Amino acid sequence: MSGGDRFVQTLQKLNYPKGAQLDGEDFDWLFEAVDLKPFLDWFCSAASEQNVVPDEKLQAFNTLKESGKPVLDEKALDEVLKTFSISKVPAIEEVAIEKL
């Protein structure tokens, strides 16, 4: 597998919008540079689908930051999320006057 084909596959995994049109052979030259090769190899190993934040979530998070609400650190999130039963506890539809 030519270094270039690996790179293009990684990009597809990372949901790059123009990734389907890219031919691997066009990037084989990037791996010929003895000095950059270690970095590119690293990148193609280190970057997976779990690392990808869609533009929507990033915008939403920036909005959250801008909203002046404190961004909970990982420890705090862990504490609070524990308290979260996966189970679809239907959003307590606040007993909509309708429910009452």
Added chain:
Amino acid sequence: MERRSLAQELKKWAVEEMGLPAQKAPSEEMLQRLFIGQCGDIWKFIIRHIHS
């Protein structure tokens, strides 16, 4: 001037955000080569959408 700046952002992204040991990080001069042609748009994407 634009290539040099992106090369710095990529370095920062690689070292600060993805945790690449500073010792293994290619020289800014060397990273500038990655922003040649169509590769430039790709790495811009990577810097923006790919996080730890």
